[PDB]
Design a protein around this ligand. Structure first.
Ligand SMILES: CC(C)(C)OC(=O)N1CCC(CCCNc2ncnc3c2ncn3[C@@H]2O[C@H](CO)[C@@H](O)[C@H]2O)CC1
Ligand SMILES: [K+]
Ligand SMILES: [K+]
Length: 546
DNA sequence: TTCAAAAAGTCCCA
DNA sequence: ATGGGACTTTTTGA
């Protein structure tokens, strides 16, 4: 559970907080890392501080105690008054203690301010000038349940529902940061857009001044780690300034060590830079350049409806054990199952633009099985092969579900109707019309149009605009970026997409029906579909005035 | 009773 | 062996 931050990022974060520190004015800066590990950040802090003191050793000697300020005394002064570290791992602190001690060449047994503790429970006796480092990330599934109760009770300002452990480290860092202090950390990027991060975003915006945000998007910063990273730099300085430097990466395929320093990367064409007024941040942080802000605001103002206004959204089936209930449509065991129980089953990859692939899997809607005596063959030979795992599901342990029932079987009538489906994680907008009463797991989301909006919006019109290049860019402006070429397509953002209705409605709908007709042909003239899409994008851009 | 969010994703291969 | 690409379960708080 120890993750190594790349050196180029560590050096950037330390320089970000210390490069303009006035060591003459304050020769006693407290620099802290509350998840210091073996000292990836703190050992670099020592080097930066040592050069800082040695460069002004004669100025300090003249201004202050001239016997105290010598070069030979810098090592002791840094460890006594400047470097602070905390980490839950006892071995890590022991290694870091040796590394700090070995920075020089017993004399007086210098004390080092290293604490082996839970940084979220430690009674911190004072505040700190500078805080740097890389907190632990633990999501809602992997976090220990007894610990979560403590977080939900004591960190409720930032931690509710499906929040993450690193939310609480943001709160702790902000709380123990001195007035006028500077904090700089690398964390997952997801809180910038996620629904769970709403409270954390409010806490940051209303308690610190966010100096800078470096968004690496889907770039792989930690080798062999499936996480997407950002660097946040904030202060508690009294300033009329309210603008954030945002550095957004332009190419996710880059390797982080192109230059000797990170700031060479940021100033280069590999990144784009723009400013955001912190006072203009709503509960959402829309961090885009001026052209995209103009683009986004044009669509928002022009569109009088949202998907949430006109549609009913729902998540797919959650069986709780797919292997027990999902079978290949050619499996001989389906001869045991009455066709009244079988539903068509698709995965996220089966969703294309405008249409769904033919299903290859079947779902046993086991909720319709009355008792274990009438359909013993289905239970004994198919579902019962996983009875132990099925019995461990939460609702089976409480008795709410029978061991053979689907955990969250939803309502069949919601799936057995004309509806629009889209994958939950995709590189692009892929909204399809489902004609085949397809069921799916939670990797596919569905919606249908409310009865009172059927005379204003058709499914054919909706998939037309939703799959357009305009709406692909439009959705991605606020979408949750997960990994390289993957965005979350979840209702908490998809249903906030705004839609319009104007004079181009009939032609847009007609072009969509032509596309659907071609896509359903045996000899798909796939080429003409692209041309029809280009014409539709022109109509949509004409409609939205972009 | 029953919804929907959550990548220190997961897994495979050249 | 690693790095990159294809693809995505069920646990969980509310
Ligand atoms: C099952 C599993 C997920 C493994 O566990 C848990 O469900 N618990 C773990 C314990 C607590 C969390 C304690 C938080 N308080 C911590 N206080 C100080 N340092 C910490 C803390 N957590 C992690 N570090 C350090 O951060 C670095 C990560 O780079 C490492 O050097 C790591 O040692 C929550 C419950
Ligand atoms: K003096
Ligand atoms: K990534």
């Amino acid at each position: 559970g120890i993750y190594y931050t790349p050196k180029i990022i560590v050096d950037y974060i330390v320089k970000k907080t210390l490069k303009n520190h006035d060591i003459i004015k304050n020769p006693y800066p407290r620099i802290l890392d509350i998840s210091c590990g073996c000292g990836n950040f703190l050992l670099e802090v020592y080097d930066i501080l040592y050069d800082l003191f040695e460069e002004n050793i004669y100025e300090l000697k003249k201004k202050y105690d001239e016997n105290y300020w010598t070069v030979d005394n810098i090592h002791r002064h840094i460890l006594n008054y400047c470097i602070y570290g905390a980490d839950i791992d006892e071995k890590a602190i022991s290694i870091l203690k040796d590394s700090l001690t070995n920075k020089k060449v017993d004399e007086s047994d210098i004390k080092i301010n290293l604490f082996c503790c839970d940084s979220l429970k430690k009674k911190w006796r004072y505040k700190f000038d500078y805080i740097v480092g890389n907190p632990p990330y633990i999501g809602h599934k992997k976090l220990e349940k007894k610990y979560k109760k403590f977080l939900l009770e004591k960190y409720s300002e930032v931690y509710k529902d499906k929040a993450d452990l690193y939310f609480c480290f943001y709160k702790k860092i902000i709380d123990i940061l001195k007035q006028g202090g500077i904090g700089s950390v690398i964390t997952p990027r997801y809180f910038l857009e996620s629904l769970s991060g709403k409270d954390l975003r409010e806490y940051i915006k209303s308690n610190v001044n966010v100096q800078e945000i470096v968004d690496f998007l889907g770039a792989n910063i930690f080798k062999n780690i499936g996480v997407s990273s950002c660097i946040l730099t904030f202060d508690k300085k009294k300033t009329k300034e309210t603008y954030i430097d945002v550095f957004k990466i332009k190419n996710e395929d880059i390797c982080i060590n192109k230059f000797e320093t990170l700031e060479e990367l940021l100033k280069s064409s590999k990144f784009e830079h723009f400013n955001i007024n912190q006072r203009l941040l709503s509960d959402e942080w829309i961090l885009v350049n001026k052209d995209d802000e103009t683009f986004y605001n044009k669509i928002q103002e022009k569109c009088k409806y949202s998907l949430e206004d006109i549609a009913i959204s729902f998540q797919g089936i959650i069986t709780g054990c797919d292997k027990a209930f999902i079978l290949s449509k050619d499996d001989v065991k389906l001869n045991l199952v009455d066709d009244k129980f079988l539903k068509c089953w698709i995965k996220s990859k089966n969703i294309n633009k405008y249409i769904v692939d033919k299903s290859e899997y079947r779902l046993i809607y086991s909720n319709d099985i009355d008792n274990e005596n009438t359909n013993k063959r289905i239970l004994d030979e198919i579902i019962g092969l996983y009875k132990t795992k099925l019995e461990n599901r939460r609702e089976c342990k409480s008795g709410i579900r029978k061991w053979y029932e689907l955990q969250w079987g939803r309502e069949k009538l919601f799936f057995e109707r004309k509806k629009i489906m889209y994958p939950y994680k995709s590189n692009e907008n892929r909204f399809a019309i489902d004609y085949d009463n397809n069921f799916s797991s939670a990797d596919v989301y569905s919606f249908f149009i409310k009865e009172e909006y059927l005379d204003k919006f058709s499914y054919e019109y909706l998939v037309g605009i939703l799959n357009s290049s305009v709406y692909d860019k439009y959705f991605k402006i606020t979408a949750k970026k997960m990994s390289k070429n993957i965005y979350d397509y979840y209702p908490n953002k998809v249903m906030k997409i705004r839609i319009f209705r104007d004079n181009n409605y009939e032609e847009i709908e007609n072009l969509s029906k032509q596309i659907i007709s071609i896509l359903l042909n045996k000899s798909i003239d796939k080429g003409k579909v692209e041309k029809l899409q280009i014409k539709m994008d022109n109509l949509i851009m004409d409609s939205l005035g972009i």
